[PDB]
Amino acid sequence: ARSAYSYIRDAWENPGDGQLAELQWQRQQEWRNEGAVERIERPTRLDKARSQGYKAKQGVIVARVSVRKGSARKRRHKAGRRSKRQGVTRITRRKDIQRVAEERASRTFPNLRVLNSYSVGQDGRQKWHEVILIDPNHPAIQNDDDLSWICADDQADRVFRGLTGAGRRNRGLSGKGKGSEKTRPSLRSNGGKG
């Protein structure tokens, strides 16, 4: 039979319809008044969180992060530039908003490590993403056969090196075949052309 979770999931397929719609029209009012990074006791999208690795356990944290919508907040050139490089308005950053959100969260929690994140909507001028972080030092996690992997040293600051899920996707590593010539094994080793 359908899991209760499946209902949360099916509701979020259309965040602009039904009860969820009214819920959002309400929450965002409180959200717009919260800060850049707010730790929250329970995930707003349980199915999504558990699906991404979440666990109601010690050392597992969640926080909602809001980032501004739109293109790069760029300064116009102050020295000579050929027309090609004189742009300001249409330039966009190569890192997606969801990735900016993951980084802002990880910095708020220096000891923790980003496990994953997901979207929880947006209003006219900002987007909110809930990030799942893990305490690599808590024994409740060091002894978890499903998460202890994040405890290894080479997982330190994993979000800042794009090892996150949204990171790897944003790095064009999704495809294993055609189209990933300049992306795998890394953007940098491919001369930064991806």
Partner: protein
């Protein structure tokens, strides 16, 4: 100069002389789907667009003859070299 709307001449298709009708080549309309069309959209961005930033050349004092010669029996046409002509008017 003046020029007969119809007159006998060789038809490269029939391979024999027949009455042809002369018409000025009306410009076909573009589809905006040719390769060059896609490159314009693709390659145009911030700043100068290279070739796509250029504009229409100009005009020669007199243009050459742009005509279609239609065979009166098989209905097919053929083109010929043109010759500079300030004006061209058909007779009948």
């Amino acid at each position: 100069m003046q020029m007969p709307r119809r007159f006998n001449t060789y038809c490269p298709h029939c391979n024999e002389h027949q009455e042809h009708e002369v018409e000025k080549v009306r410009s076909g309309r573009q589809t905006g789907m040719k390769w060059i069309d896609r490159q314009r959209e693709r390659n145009s961005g911030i700043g100068n667009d290279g070739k796509f930033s250029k504009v229409p050349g100009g005009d020669k004092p007199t243009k050459k003859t742009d005509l279609k010669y239609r065979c009166g029996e098989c209905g097919k046409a053929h083109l010929r070299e043109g010759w500079r002509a300030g004006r061209l008017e058909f007779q009948e």
